[PDB]
């Protein structure tokens, strides 16, 4: 009340952190970092609860202190560091370069990308204005800021950003006909192609997207993330990429029963 | 202490509002600086929210005043306070606040005018070949020029002395000046 809060109750944790209700009174509060602490997956919830590498809040530390975790091309030790979207969690030694992608149910998935594809990432772009001494800068959506950007780059764009030599390799503008993945709300994790953008003077830029399998859905100007030019994404999607409503999930379970086992 | 809450005020319906909490620090107030025009300058540092610093000027004698028409800013000493829009006892007490009319000596401005326009009021070839160019458009208001002989120019304070610790301002000209002259003449 008189200041900041350093505790996060388990029942107050974000939903995509599927945490057992009777597992404790507290959840790991995400540290300050590049991502918004509600759309992030802390490292504690990576070496635990997603991989069986660590078993407690004592071996996550025991393997972070060995400097074994390299997120976004940099060794990180803070166990509650907020890896939030498409961050390259590159585990050295064993080589587990993982892109944090959005499951069709709003979850977080560690898509195992190849090593040479793990040397870059992509970032969404916030406003672009003039800095001190009249030097334009980028100010992406994951805390990153890049000075001297190419003048074609504008707001809401996406940039393919290198890691070892941090410079913009190329970029995709925000326009209709581009692959887009939704990263917020109920439509999280659904890829599609923008059909038209509707503009309301004052607020609420609404984007209408067409799914590959024929479905259509709308969302805000936020929560969307351009992925690739035209209809070809620049990254490997985890699987499915379609909403897959409950009935067809039941059908998949049925055919899994009727095949494979089939007995 | 002094607070800025609406807690003690009354509703727009004229009904008394009760109290459900104590006073809070983040809504405090402080005593006014009550800056004075005096020769013994004194400015005291204040520590404000966030750890930043406010400069509370208790006494000032000089200032940074700008002639907008010629766009020249000079440091000069204030001589008197002649008008105060809000309170008529703030000129009797000679209190430096924003929008308070003051008088500043014209010596720096006379010196700049002489060395720039080549004209005194109140070298081989380049300087003379450039001086008449500035003398071609040289024009001054009669009310502006009549104060150089007197040695003091009417001016207005645009800074907040109790906040920035300084008294800067601009020289009164045009439609402003006579409006105050008709208020200062008697």
């Amino acid at each position: 009340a008189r200041g900041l809060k350093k505790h996060l109750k388990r029942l107050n944790a974000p939903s995509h952190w599927m945490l057992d209700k009777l597992g404790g009174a507290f959840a790991p509060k995400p540290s300050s970092g590049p991502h918004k602490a509600r759309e992030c997956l802390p490292l504690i919830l990576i070496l635990r609860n997603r991989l069986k590498y660590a078993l407690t809040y004592r071996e996550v530390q025991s393997i972070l202190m060995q400097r074994h975790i390299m997120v976004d091309g940099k060794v990180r030790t803070d166990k509650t560091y907020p890896a939030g979207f498409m961050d390259i969690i590159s585990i050295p030694k064993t080589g587990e370069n993982y892109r944090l992608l959005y499951d069709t149910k709003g979850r977080f998935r560690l898509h195992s990308v190849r090593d040479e594809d793990a040397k870059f990432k992509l970032c969404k772009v916030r406003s672009v204005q003039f800095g001190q001494k009249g030097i334009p800068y980028l100010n992406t959506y994951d805390g990153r800021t890049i000075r001297y950007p190419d003048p074609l780059i504008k707001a809401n764009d996406t940039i393919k950003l290198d890691l070892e030599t941090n410079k913009i390799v190329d970029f995709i503008k925000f326009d209709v006909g581009n692959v887009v993945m939704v990263t917020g709300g109920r439509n999280t994790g659904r890829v599609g192609v923008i059909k038209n953008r509707e503009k309301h003077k004052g607020t609420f830029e609404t984007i209408h997207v067409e799914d590959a399998q024929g479905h259509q859905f709308a969302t805000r100007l936020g929560n969307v993330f351009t992925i690739g030019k035209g209809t070809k994404p620049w990254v490997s999607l985890p699987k499915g990429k379609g909403i897959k409503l409950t009935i067809i999930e039941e059908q998949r379970k049925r055919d899994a029963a009727a095949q494979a086992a089939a007995k | 202490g002094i607070s800025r809450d609406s807690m003690h005020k009354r509703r727009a319906t004229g009904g008394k509002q009760k109290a459900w909490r104590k006073k809070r620090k983040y809504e405090l107030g402080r005593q006014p600086a009550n800056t004075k025009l005096s020769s013994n300058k004194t400015v005291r540092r204040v520590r404000v929210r966030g750890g930043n610093v406010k400069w509370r000027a208790l006494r000032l004698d000089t200032g940074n005043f700008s002639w907008g028409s010629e766009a020249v800013t000079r440091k000069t000493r204030l001589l008197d306070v002649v008008y105060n829009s809000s309170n008529n006892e703030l000129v009797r007490t000679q209190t430096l606040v924003k929008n308070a009319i003051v008088q500043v000596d014209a010596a720096p401005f006379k010196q700049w005018y002489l060395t720039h326009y080549g004209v005194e009021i109140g070298k081989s070839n380049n300087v003379q070949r450039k001086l008449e160019k500035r003398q071609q458009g040289r024009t001054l208001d009669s009310h502006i020029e009549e104060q150089f002989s007197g040695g003091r120019l009417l001016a207005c304070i645009s800074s907040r002395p109790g906040q920035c610790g300084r008294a800067d301002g601009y020289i009164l000209e045009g439609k402003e000046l006579e409006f105050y002259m008709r208020k200062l003449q008697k």
Binding site: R10, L245, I247 | -
Partner: protein, 183 residues
């Protein structure tokens, strides 16, 4: 805070509105008598579960046929019924499940199936044998007479390996008698 407070919990029987009625009392006593129960609670909880299922089915049947929030849970309810041996293969509609009754549920209890499988001399002997750890479903010992068996496990009920009735060593009574006869 106490984290244990977050565990959900509920009640399973309801008790009747009118406590003293002759016809209802005789009906309940009749059912208890040949289904080998212990009290009216063992039957009231079955009534409660059946009432919940019937209410769900009735709510589903009120919706339009082309409503997915009818198709999905209609399929789920019929799947559960066909899984627990309640609805026959000739009753694959949401209307038949509204016609279910308490004896359908009581016929699927482990005690009832043990009695009807010829392993027990009477439905009370079945309950006694169940509570004495003599019966295993599949490979798992069960000592709960209310265990509702499924169709796929109906062919695996058998006396346990540890049981003297399923190939175990003699109980303490027989061993005591052998000790007495030894000397």
């Amino acid at each position: 805070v106490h984290v244990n407070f977050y565990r959900n919990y509920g009640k399973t029987f309801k008790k009747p509105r009118r406590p003293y009625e002759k016809e209802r009392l005789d009906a309940e006593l009749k059912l208890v008598g040949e289904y080998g129960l212990r009290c009216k609670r063992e039957l009231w909880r079955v009534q409660y579960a059946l009432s919940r299922i019937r209410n769900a089915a009735r709510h589903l049947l009120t919706l339009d046929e082309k409503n997915p929030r009818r198709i999905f849970e209609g399929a789920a309810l019929l799947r559960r019924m066909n899984r627990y041996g309640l609805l026959a293969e000739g009753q694959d509609k949401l209307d038949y499940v509204l016609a279910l009754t308490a004896e359908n549920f009581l016929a699927r209890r482990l005690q009832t199936l043990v009695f009807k499988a010829g392993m027990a001399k009477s439905i009370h002997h079945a309950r006694v044998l169940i509570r004495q750890r003599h019966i295993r479903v599949g490979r798992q010992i069960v000592n709960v007479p209310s265990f509702m068996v499924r169709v796929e496990s109906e062919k695996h009920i058998d006396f346990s390996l540890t049981s003297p009735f399923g190939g175990g060593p003699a109980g303490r009574v027989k061993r005591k008698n052998q000790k007495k006869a030894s000397g």
